[PDB]
Subunit: 338 residues, 6 copies
């Protein structure tokens, strides 16, 4: 029924004060939710930012009525111990009930390498993520808990500041295996843009995981984050993607690359063709609308849109005028909340 769409707040690119103002505008223009990445570093120096997301989310919560979530935090003990992520999530939900969702994932070296520890392969980090989920869920019971596993140790700990109902745990992944585990263990899925076949596989795996654990997946959020480039001309939209988001044209695993300067050098190889299916680059707002509608039709219940250009205000107003009012959402779609 009612108008809605998610806005991606790009901490890699934009000063937190600007993001705050733009989220306030996005709310006025019909966006209903915000996705905020948890980075320490940008992908490139040209992007040039990386605010501490947890502080900013407090400001967002206090000055808007938007829903919001981390997209995503790695609670696997490099930058963040899982107990701290649990406390942070509980505090946000306690302050802003019904508004926060905790998005988590297996992390990238770009952010995690700063603490100077062994960086496991993806499959091992998945195992760490699953153990972290166990820790977070124990703490979310609001009782005194202990934990000893392969990766984490928690001595007697309790979250005294705990909402009546915990925030949902959303896993951000593009892997079939983890998508199934997300359905089994967590409350919802967040995935990046990809071709129809890959998206259907992830949805299917998530649903199968949920059903095998006795859950109803039709009531569970299935969310997607997409990257677009809107501008006044097609040429400007293409140029914006090349300059601002060359990582979008890197169709290869990026989780081991440590430095912004590394991505910067790799970016010199990226060309417009490499953004096919990964960043929609056009001035034609009808085409933005059709792209988003197609994702709803596949079964996504929320979409978070990252415009890669620095023209955030103009993008927000353009989407508010020409895109968001024409999107048709199922009336009973679940959203990430409560």
């Amino acid at each position: 029924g009612s108008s809605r769409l998610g806005y991606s707040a790009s901490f890699e690119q934009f000063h937190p004060s600007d993001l705050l103002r733009w989220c306030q505008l996005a709310e006025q223009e019909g966006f209903d939710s915000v996705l905020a990445a948890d980075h320490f570093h940008p992908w490139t120096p040209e992007q040039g930012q990386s605010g501490f997301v947890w502080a900013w989310l407090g400001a967002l919560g206090a000055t808007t009525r938007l829903r919001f979530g981390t997209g995503v935090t790695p609670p696997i003990g490099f930058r963040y111990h899982p107990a701290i992520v649990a406390q942070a999530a509980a505090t946000l939900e306690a302050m802003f009930p019904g508004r926060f969702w905790l998005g988590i994932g297996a992390g990238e070296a770009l952010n995690e390498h700063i603490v100077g520890r062994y960086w496991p392969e993806p499959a091992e980090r998945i195992r760490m993520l699953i153990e972290a989920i166990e820790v977070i869920q124990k703490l979310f019971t609001g009782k005194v808990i202990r934990h000893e596993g392969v990766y984490f140790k928690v001595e007697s700990a309790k979250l005294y500041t705990m909402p009546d109902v915990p925030p949902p745990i959303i896993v951000g992944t593009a892997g079939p295996y983890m998508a199934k585990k997300t359905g089994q263990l967590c409350d919802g899925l967040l995935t990046p843009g990809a071709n129809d076949e890959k998206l259907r596989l992830l949805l299917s795996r998530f649903e199968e995981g949920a059903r095998a654990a006795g859950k109803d997946p039709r009531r569970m959020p299935r969310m997607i984050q997409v990257h677009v480039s809107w501008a006044e001309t097609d040429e400007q939209a293409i140029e914006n993607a090349l300059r601002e988001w060359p990582n979008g044209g890197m169709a290869f695993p990026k989780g081991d690359i440590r430095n912004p300067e590394d991505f910067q050098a790799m970016a010199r190889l990226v060309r417009p063709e490499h953004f096919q299916g990964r960043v929609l680059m056009t001035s034609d707002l009808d085409r933005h609308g059709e792209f988003l509608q197609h994702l709803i039709d596949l079964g996504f219940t929320e979409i978070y849109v990252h415009n890669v250009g620095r023209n955030q205000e103009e993008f927000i107003r353009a989407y508010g005028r020409a895109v968001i009012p024409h999107l048709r959402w199922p009336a009973d779609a679940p959203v990430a909340q409560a």
Copy 2:
């Protein structure tokens, strides 16, 4: 000219209540907030522990108060020093001139949850000094590396960095660390104590600053005090016993792990034990004289924690009868980017 600091007790109060009370404190003439960084309360009866970093974002966005952590331990248990640096930089970037980073050696109550060796105080001081080195490197806004006894930092840069870093304030009651604070940091925060102990800490801080070529007359010297105001003396005493028995524990508390431990120790505490540690009276003239004495010793800021649950009434009482009558030196330095 009129001013005073308010201590926001995360151990006792829900973060939503603290936010509303800080907004009221601003209206009533308080100009600054001190917020503890806890994971656990001292006792179950206190019953809270919000994630301070998220809350500070909300405070920043809804008030014009100055504010700081009182204090964070950046020594790699709950928090890696690089993360504290990023968090501090983000708050100061969002709220320029308003944040001060208070740090300290930490307590087992909060740090023990991660299940690691807990060093003696003198060793934790060495960890704190190394953490300061890490934070200060990151505050240059350049790519830095670090390898010391306690911390390792791979190539790291704070891209989201204010023009001028927030001040680093050390919270300590030790003469040695007070001197080091003057030498290495921007200001001192200390608890209430007798005149002789306070003069020693001030003196050590000043000597440390002077020997490093700094002018200590321009550097904040801050004190956090605990009081109990209520409508009667009897209610004020009862409030301290029930809410803050840790205030009557004249012994080192940094090794005690569990709220349940403090709870059992609290059964020994009696009114006499609060002498010189918590002022318990309905007489607001006596509150005024106690605070004025501390100003006269040379403290440039005072943060007052009322231990009772009557926060709103306390704030209004201090706003009416105490804050207007305090006499501060004209050019006294406050904790702010200088």
Copy 3:
């Protein structure tokens, strides 16, 4: 029906080892038959002011008396002491003084263990360490070459060549219901501190249930209690002695994480006479000491070790020898901690 006897607690926290040796010799003359010695590195407070190395002192006690004796208790969990070393020490004492030694063990306190600067686990984890240590000690007590690899301890090929025919019993010192049950299941007997009747009955009950579920007969297993008392010429002196000398006795809260004597010293300033209720009997009335001890026998304790908290050790020993010990009635076939 059984002969007169009672245990004496030698307080290493308070008294020079030479004084303890002389007083134990006197205690033997006065009718005490057994000694309990704590294994500390530090006293609870500076005012207590001592901490001898118990293992050396026990050799002196063994060679100059016919008293039975035990550690009350040693922590064999790899901070100050690797379990293999405790096993060797125990085996040597029993080999030198057959039928006289019992090995009392426990999960330890930071006060003593923190000196080696290692991670100090929570109580539940230290229980797991204690259980593994028991396994190590029992393997070594077979007198064969053994190896061990567990979560906490590694033992390469090791054998106790100096080994009595029959091992000393392993006694666990605990006040926890769970560990009391495990003691019955895994060990040879129980040592517990003085406490109210309800708590003592619960511990005995748990110990007995643990023993029975493992197919053992708990009636043949020692159930020992260490009590803290204050005797003096007046009630007022007895109370003052407890306050000054043993304020830790009035600390009804977990003490296993507190590292320094100076920490307990500062905490002691909060302790008052009321806090000793059920923990330290404070009276000059020796009939009342006699009734208190007899009651503990009647509850089912088979040995009692008495720690007088005052510095008046000689006078205490003579008073108990004259007025208390001859009137105690022990069951005839009560099991004592011995091979």
Copy 4:
């Protein structure tokens, strides 16, 4: 004037027997005891290894002999240095003027049981030097802390502390450590060896002491020797072969882990291998001359280990025919506070 040290062999003898024999040794004119700190014997045929610290309490309480460990390794395998310090302080507090703390770099035979990396000798020397630092800090009787390469000590104090600490004696056969012993400690203990090696060790010890401003003429220089006395030469030889084949193993033994290893190596040992390492004879005049020669080299105390099981007969024989005829310098320093 008359005196001599008795070595109590924990590797061979039940602690009760050692106690009785030390009491007899005192009656027969021995004035001091050296007791090894082992966990295992060299061979199963030796067959013992009492916990020395407990036994020393019994010795202290039933004799007036001086006594020391010969030696303890305080380098954190079986024993953390803080524990050795406490043990030493307790013995000296109980038996003032009687205990000396002999320490050394240890052997795998005893230390391997805890399942940790066993460093080469030169590295274990560095560990020993750090252990000495820890023990000396604790012997001040104040609250101390320590953090070094090998050891960590949190706030620790020996509350049971004699007025004057026991001397620290290092047992070593290495020139380097002998020099360090003179510099850092109170005296030297070394095994029997040829004249040239002994002179080198004494010289290094003296040079180390002098460079640290100490007077080495007031510092103990002690030697432990192995002998075999019996009624006939043939019995003395047989006793050494059966009881102390390790005495005929002229090779480094500090890495060998098991009694069963030494037992198998023992099958190669023959009488010839004891030349200069174990004196084997019934002739007590020859025992006397051997000991006197060591005094003449400058040793101020000698601890004698008779390798045979005939300890009582050995003690009485030495008491009658050897000890009265030894000539000690009048003011020779002994290991004591």
Copy 5:
């Protein structure tokens, strides 16, 4: 004095084929071989990675070529530095005057298999410098010990040791390590790069050597280049794209773990990306001029890797049309004892 080096690409070719081709290269006028020490190829399409140390034994025994590792990482992931030292000493002992030990800071592609913390480049340089210290100690042919930040060596000696050690050559493209190479080692190996970068590396190497009292004019300065020769320009370009896309990746590659990662990154590479990194042409005169230019810059040896699978045809073409026309300075130092 016609000569040139052949690069044996273990990433691409079966070791039996490499052996046969090196034998042919010798017949055709190549005088030296460079062999990479990999565990994995850059891509599955390359498809090989023999154990170089075994192969070098075969090369040594069936040719008279000089040869070296280009390069081994002796920094304790795949290889402890003591093992590299022994391997180098054995090859030089078997083939005197023929082996040079090329070492470097390593790549995750090969080292990640052991599952350990992978330090940043600057830290791995520090590890490399310590490894050099270990190798040089072992090359003295005496019993040595070592304890540093990264490596521990207990009493160790190379008993099989040539009279004169093989030279240590460092492979690096970093100015700092180039200077350290001049200071600490015997020569430099660097990849192809623009003139300005090559001059900087040579200059740093020379400055390092001179400050340590060495004469850099007597020290090898070696370069490894990648080329693509084929019958047509089009075939040469296609060969580079298919076989060596890593050659068109102008970005740091030392953290990338899997062949599958490079394979996916390769999809972005185009002919333009090989400019200045892989010379792609059928014109052998142009190959000759490219190599001559590097000699003129001051390189004393060049190792040529042809990226195509047409190795035999490449070797014969270079032997006929390139190698005879190269003009080397008369007394140029080569990597040899």
Copy 6:
């Protein structure tokens, strides 16, 4: 069967260039296979060598048609990570198909101590060896594999240079337990010379292990390495053994001894009698022949002979003339080679 015998190339004693020339001669004289030890140090300075075996094997492979193997390599992560041993083995077999066998064992401190790590007891090193076998076998599948166990971690790894059929894994052991495990997990057994009873037990255990895992032990190699001393006179043969191989007369475990200088000092105790049953010392080549034939008759399918004297050329020619032609091998006896 056709005439054959194995030659042991003693890296402890001989320069690799000499070993290469002698193996080439051994081939001409009727030896068909070579066993090469993987050492870092010799047992004694008087032996005086230790080439890097992996490089030498490349030279051997390229200049002969002999079979050859390591006797043995320890792939347990001191000198060598198991993944590296796998790669090395795969490369040799790829270059010399049908010719290489990978002999592995639990290793000795003499070689492994140089890296300065904890040296486990034999039983623990067996567990490490079993895990190493798991790693090598995973890599020998020629696919991308991962591994995480108690001792080893392997991230995504693949041997791209891999022969069609892997080289056999041969375990060198004298322990009954490991011999059984070798039959169960590996392709063949290598054992030292020993009395008949011990050899029969090892063969039997190996066979039982193979059969219980569904394998056919009749097709699996059972190999023995023996030490002999041949010379012109018996006296010269004895003198050669004393001077060159005193470790042969050390009937005690040698796996913990770190330094050549240690063995050198221990060697001073060794006498001719100590070589009884361990080194055959005689000029009589008929007696060499009977000794070897007896081992064939026990069921060994290959024998590797180490002559301890420096007279290698003369030994090789003597065996080629007088011993090898007279040995009678079973017709279809399995040899260590890919099958």
